[PDB]
Amino acid sequence: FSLLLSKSILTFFEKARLALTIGLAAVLYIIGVPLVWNMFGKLYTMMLDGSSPYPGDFLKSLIYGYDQSATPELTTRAIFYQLLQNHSFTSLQFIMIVILHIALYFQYDMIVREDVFSKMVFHKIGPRINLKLKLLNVIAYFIIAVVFTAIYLAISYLFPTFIGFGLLKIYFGIFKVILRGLCHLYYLSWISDHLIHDIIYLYNGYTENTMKHSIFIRALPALTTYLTSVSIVCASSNLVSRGYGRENGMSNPTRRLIFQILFALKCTFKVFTLFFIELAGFPILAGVMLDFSLFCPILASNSRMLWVPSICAIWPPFSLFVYWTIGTLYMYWFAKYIGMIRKNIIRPGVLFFIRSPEDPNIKILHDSLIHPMSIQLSRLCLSMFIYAIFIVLGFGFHTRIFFPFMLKSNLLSVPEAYKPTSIISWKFNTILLTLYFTKRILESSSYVKPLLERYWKTIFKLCSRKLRLSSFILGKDTPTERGHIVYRNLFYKYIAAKNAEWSNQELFTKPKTLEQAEELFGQVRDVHAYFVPDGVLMRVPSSDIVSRNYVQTMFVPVTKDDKLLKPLDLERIKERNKRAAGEFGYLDEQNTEYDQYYIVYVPPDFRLRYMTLLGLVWLFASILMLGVTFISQALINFVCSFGFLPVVKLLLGERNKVYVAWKELSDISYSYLNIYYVCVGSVCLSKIAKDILHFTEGIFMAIFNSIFDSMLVKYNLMVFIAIMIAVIRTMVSWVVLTDGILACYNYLDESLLFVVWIISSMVNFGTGYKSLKLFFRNRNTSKLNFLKTMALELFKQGFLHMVIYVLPIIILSTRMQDIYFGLLIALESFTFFFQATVLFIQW
Ligand SMILES: CCCCCCCCCCCCCCCCCC(=O)OC[C@H](COP(=O)([O-])OCC[N+](C)(C)C)OC(=O)CCCCCCCCCCCCCCCCC
Ligand SMILES: CC(C)CCC[C@@H](C)[C@H]1CC[C@H]2[C@@H]3CC=C4C[C@@H](OC(=O)CCC(=O)O)CC[C@]4(C)[C@H]3CC[C@]12C
Ligand SMILES: CC(C)[C@@H](C)/C=C/[C@@H](C)[C@H]1CC[C@H]2C3=CC=C4C[C@@H](O)CC[C@]4(C)[C@H]3CC[C@]12C
């Protein structure tokens, strides 16, 4: 036994050495390194200002720094809270810096690898003791990390901030000169005064060093230095490229490499800016207007203007994540709607400007490199403005200017008692989970989308037929749409429209011009209406995937036989193409595989007609959404006020808390908006959708699938079970030790009990990590297999441990004292002996 006993002691020593090396390295690299970074940042800020926030005492200065806590005390608890906050701040800064560097390097690599980038470049320049040893390493690496952090923070914050002071003083002087010139030109109280006050406040805070806490006012000099450096790089690329071209070769190799680097950086910044806008600022601003128009008037008061900032009061930066999420969700749903319309309802070619999700001729990087930044940015701005019109007008009208004022109704406003106030609150979480589960149920159903598509087909056909846009929007039109019916009198035009139409028996048989129609009205009294053809046939693109050059030639009027009514102005088209392109126009090679055109009829006043069509689309979408919402709410309310509530009144009583809660909920629902009722009714109508489809031409299973099949619920449940089993086994272990061995020893210092509790907690967190390992193995398994595996694991490592140790003690709890204590000692000794025997057998 002695030989491999000593060997096992050596293995335990190796374990302990490895555990200590990992633990010390982890604690240092996770705590000290962010704290060393933050202390160096505070020291550099003090050097820049020249004075510490707390003169003389540098610890408090290096602990609290430039914070708003008024004279905080040096309490160990206060110190711990402050250091946690400092660690969070520095972790956020480091994460942001690392992400920015990674994104920029990836953009640089992708652009450099691109072949069209090489073509652009060629166009511009033209052709040519062991434990101790390990620890030593850990400490040495930590010292290297600390000195690297000091140097990097120096070169990245200290010097940039000083150069920022200089450059920002220069720019303030230049701005002052420009303002003086503007005032001279000009010469030769609530809103503006408030804005002037805010700007003067910011300027005084920066210049007089009063705002020492603001992140923005501290980063202003460094940000100015970085922006100036970027501007210099972008301008110097063009400056180096001056003169040289495809004809004038650039012989010098060093200058060639310098330009290659500068141009790569310029393209990196251009593509990064465009992508950052389109992917963050586009969704974030869309979410901001969604908050302004829909969420704030509904989940908050109409008087307020934004709602997400209030619920993100815990950590205001999370409002950006919330805004991005809601904006991205809105854009995804709008893209789905446009996809449905494009797929089935409207003519293929109408929505050519909107980007087609399934387009083989998509080269995002190539287009970002070649097309000028101004043109792409302008297209983004107009698309953003159109999305703003849709969001703000379409939702905010109903939520702000229609229901509260015209109808004087709170039917589109959550009741005061159920308005969420914080993101972590139960109200917000319940609303969000209800919406998520209902969305999952609706998407899972196979009859909702079809019915919706049929509704939109009917709506589009009706609106287009009314506006005489059937040919342009749908592709099929009767000849009656190709002219307006001129009536003799306004009475016949409006009051007697049907009578006047019936009077003319030659209306659609023969076309009459306007002057001829007036002449016939003057001559004859029997007929008071005639058909006057108007509008001209036009060429329109026959597919959504059409080269941008083709679009510039495919909106020209034509005769019946595909002959242009006016000779095409080719030179103007070429000039517009040159403007739409840039120095790199020829490099773009647009594919003409899908460049075909339809000859469709376009009525007069086309712009007004399709604007009215979009207005009618908004009107009918609003009618559909409001009808679905209110029908769902009314259906559930009728079911849950004339249905279950009387039953609860009989069974649960008339004064029970549950009965009062649901009764008040229903009574408010008759006048307010309950999202829960709306969602449940939406599920019910989704079920009725099949019957609706059949006539016009299970529930619990679906709910179960949607709930217990989503990855969110699975992850939440598995984490909950892991925590539960860990805490259960910790309670078992602590109770066993204390109310067993300790009590028996006493029969025969909180610090020690907390220490052993920590040890048991660590070992049982390892036990829980065993279940976490089970999670990954069973992540994709079926619901029944998942539930059975989870139940067996929980049972065995939970209630089995419960029964083996605690329950006999439960039952067991003069000679009877001795019997009790001896029996408990014997059972503990038997368990210890069994464990030791198993370990010895394995050994
Ligand atoms: C960059 C702009 C695109 C923005 C992307 C996001 C917008 C989402 C879709 C909204 C469509 C409405 C915007 C119309 C803008 C037309 C710009 C253009 O390039 O036109 C050139 C063309 C030609 O204009 P022209 O007749 O002046 O001729 C110009 C001739 N050349 C090219 C030689 C100079 O105009 C059109 O073809 C207009 C067609 C509009 C058809 C409308 C389809 C309705 C179907 C419903 C979809 C909308 C659902 C959302 C509605 C919800 C309301 C709340
Ligand atoms: C205000 C300063 C101090 C920092 C600003 C950071 C924000 C603008 C953050 C908050 C949420 C971040 C977004 C959170 C997550 C992602 C997902 C990511 O998605 C993809 O890259 C898709 C790629 C593919 O699948 O092809 C794009 C960046 C983005 C939106 C981030 C962009 C930057 C955002 C908007
Ligand atoms: C205003 C310009 C013309 C003058 C003053 C140049 C200032 C230099 C010091 C600036 C301009 C660009 C800055 C710069 C660019 C890129 C990086 C990489 C990053 O990972 C750390 C910061 C670091 C290393 C900084 C250091 C400071 C630089 C080099």
DSSP 8-state class, residue 376: H
Lookup: tokens for 307: 């709602």
Looking at the domain assignment, is residue 529 inside a domain? yes
Ligand nearest to the CA of 282: 2
Q: What determination technique applies here? A: cryo-EM
User: For residue 615, which atom of ligand 1 is closest to its CA?
Assistant: 53
- Round to whole Å and give the CA distance between 530 and 629: 45
Q: How far is the CA of 558 from the centre of ligand 3 (A)?
A: 60
Residue ranges of the alpha helices (H) in 644-749? 644-651, 657-669, 675-696, 699-709, 711-736, 743-747
Q: Which of 229, 262, 265 to mutate to test the pocket of ligand 3 (most atoms within 8 A of CB)?
A: 229
Torsion sign, CA atoms 49, 52, 56, 59: negative
User: Contact, 64 vs 53, CB < 8 A?
Assistant: yes
Report the C-alpha dihedral over residues 182, 184, 187, 190, rounded to 10 degrees: 40
User: What's the helix, strand, coil split of the chain in %, to 5?
Assistant: 75, 5, 25
For this experimental structure, what is the resolution in angstroms?
3.2
Torsion sign, CA atoms 283, 289, 290, 295: positive
Neighbours of 131 (CB within 10 A): 14
- Round to whole Å and give the CA distance between 290 and 586: 41
Looking at the domain assignment, is residue 808 inside a domain? yes
Question: Which of 251, 271, 290 is at the close of a domain?
Answer: 251
Looking at the domain assignment, is residue 338 inside a domain? no
Three-state secondary-structure class, residue 485: strand
Is 613 touching ligand 1 by the criterion CB < 6 Å? yes
Q: Kindly report the backbone phi and psi dihedral angles of residue 358, in degrees, each rounded to the nearest multiple of 5, phi listed first.
A: -110, 85
DSSP 8-state class, residue 560: T
Burial of 309 (0-12, 13-18, 19+ CB in 10 A): middle
Number of structural domains the chain divides into: 3
Q: What angle do CA 443, 446, 451 make, to 5 degrees?
A: 95
Contacts of 73 (CB under 8 A, 6+ apart): none
Q: Which helix (H) or strand (E) holds 521?
A: helix 514-523
Whats the size of the chain, residue-wise?
843
Nearest C-alpha neighbor of 339 from the set 327, 325, 351? 351
Is 552 touching ligand 1 by the criterion CB < 6 Å? yes
Question: Which of 222, 251, 280 is at the close of a domain?
Answer: 251
Chain centroid to CA 744: how far? 59
Q: How far are the Cα atoms of 19, 33, 148, 821 from residue 26, in angstroms, in the given order?
A: 10, 10, 18, 44
DSSP 8-state class, residue 356: P
User: Contact, 393 vs 292, CB < 8 A?
Assistant: no
User: Contact, 527 vs 547, CB < 8 A?
Assistant: no
User: For residue 321, which atom of ligand 2 is closest to its CA?
Assistant: 11
Looking at the domain assignment, is residue 256 inside a domain? no
Looking at the domain assignment, is residue 789 inside a domain? yes
Q: How far are the Cα atoms of 2, 310, 328, 491 from residue 322, in angstroms, in the given order?
A: 63, 12, 10, 57
- Round to whole Å and give the CA distance between 319 and 311: 8
Is 156 touching ligand 3 by the criterion CB < 6 Å? yes
Residue in the structure block whose two tokens are 């893209």:
335
DSSP 8-state class, residue 529: E
Is 614 touching ligand 1 by the criterion CB < 6 Å? yes
Q: Which of 223, 225, 262 to mutate to test the pocket of ligand 3 (most atoms within 8 A of CB)?
A: 225
Three-state secondary-structure class, residue 131: helix
Burial of 288 (0-12, 13-18, 19+ CB in 10 A): buried
Provide the pairing of β-strand 597-602 with 483-487.
Answer: unpaired
Which residue range(s) make up the domain with 482? 474-568
Among protein residues, the one with the nearest Cα to ligand 2's atom 23 is 279
Torsion sign, CA atoms 311, 317, 319, 325: negative
Three-state secondary-structure class, residue 602: strand
Looking at the domain assignment, is residue 363 inside a domain? no
Looking at the domain assignment, is residue 404 inside a domain? no
DSSP 8-state class, residue 672: S
Torsion sign, CA atoms 424, 430, 435, 436: positive
Ligand nearest to the CA of 600: 1
Report the C-alpha dihedral over residues 805, 806, 811, 815, rounded to 10 degrees: 70
Q: Which helix (H) or strand (E) holds 15?
A: helix 2-27
Q: How far is the CA of 231 from the centre of ligand 2 (A)?
A: 24
Question: Which of 568, 589, 623 is at the close of a domain?
Answer: 568
Q: How far are the Cα atoms of 39, 487, 499, 524, 741 from residue 516, in angstroms, in the given order?
A: 90, 12, 21, 12, 114
Residue in the structure block whose two tokens are 């209800």:
434
Looking at the domain assignment, is residue 277 inside a domain? no
Lookup: tokens for 374: 């101004």
Among protein residues, the one with the nearest Cα to ligand 1's atom 52 is 618
